[PDB]
Design a binder for this molecule. Sequence first.
Ligand SMILES: NC(=O)c1cc([N+](=O)[O-])ccc1NCc1cnccn1
Length: 294
Amino acid sequence: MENFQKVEKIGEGTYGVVYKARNKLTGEVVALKKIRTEGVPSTAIREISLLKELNHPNIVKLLDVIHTENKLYLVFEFLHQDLKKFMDASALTGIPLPLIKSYLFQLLQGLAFCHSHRVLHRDLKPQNLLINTEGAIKLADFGLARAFGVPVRTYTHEVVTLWYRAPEILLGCKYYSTAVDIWSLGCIFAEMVTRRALFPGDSEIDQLFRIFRTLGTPDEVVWPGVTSMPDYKPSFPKWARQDFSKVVPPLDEDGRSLLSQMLHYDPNKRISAKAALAHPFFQDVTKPVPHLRL
Ligand SMILES: NC(=O)c1cc([N+](=O)[O-])ccc1NCc1cnccn1
């Protein structure tokens, strides 16, 4: 607002416009998000305010929540680049495996923390993962979807991606669990490895069928209860599961094994962030410094 001098528009998120701004008094540089209408659910403000206590090194810190004139501003710690941008910039040679592994490991520590505190992200995607020059990666917008809701776009005609959405969400399950975040992270993990989105659906049904075409159409054997879900249709085509080795080549067996557990259809069989941290894939994990051009 007036306490903050806008440095520039960082973009227009799935909620509202985001600016890079400097606190005229503290000199701190932050990310200011103008939340989209006419009242601001008091329930929403309490939820959001709880998130200010959710502090972890791999979680973008929510510094302040400012409610004024039906407008809600969220002040976040600022990071210079997101993983989507970094992946595009690394498309020619790919992100080195030690760095992919470091990033996956840090993201899982972040999820483990939020999940132990009963906070869900629900909308993880590369653009929501921020990185810095120190080799750190952080989860942005944790808990906002719950304090608010699931968008059809953003706030003003903007196609929200479904590429990282768990199948239980696509099948209409009303109660999501921490498992939805593990699914999204597995999709991101695969994308870092192959340099191409795993399931780039362009509609809810195309998203679902792209998943089915790769992991096989789910049935009662692999996913007890699936045929009774809200949007499940007996008319869904029946595709056979594809060999995992064809999915994320040339990822090694440790990596393929972890990814397979992160992409289990049954949310109850899907690996937790905590258990994933103990997976043999992280046996030689390290913290490399990325080459970022800011
Ligand atoms: N907290 C942030 O720093 C940040 C916030 C949003 N957002 O709320 O939509 C988007 C990108 C961000 N950083 C990455 C970034 C910042 N400036 C230029 C390029 N990338």
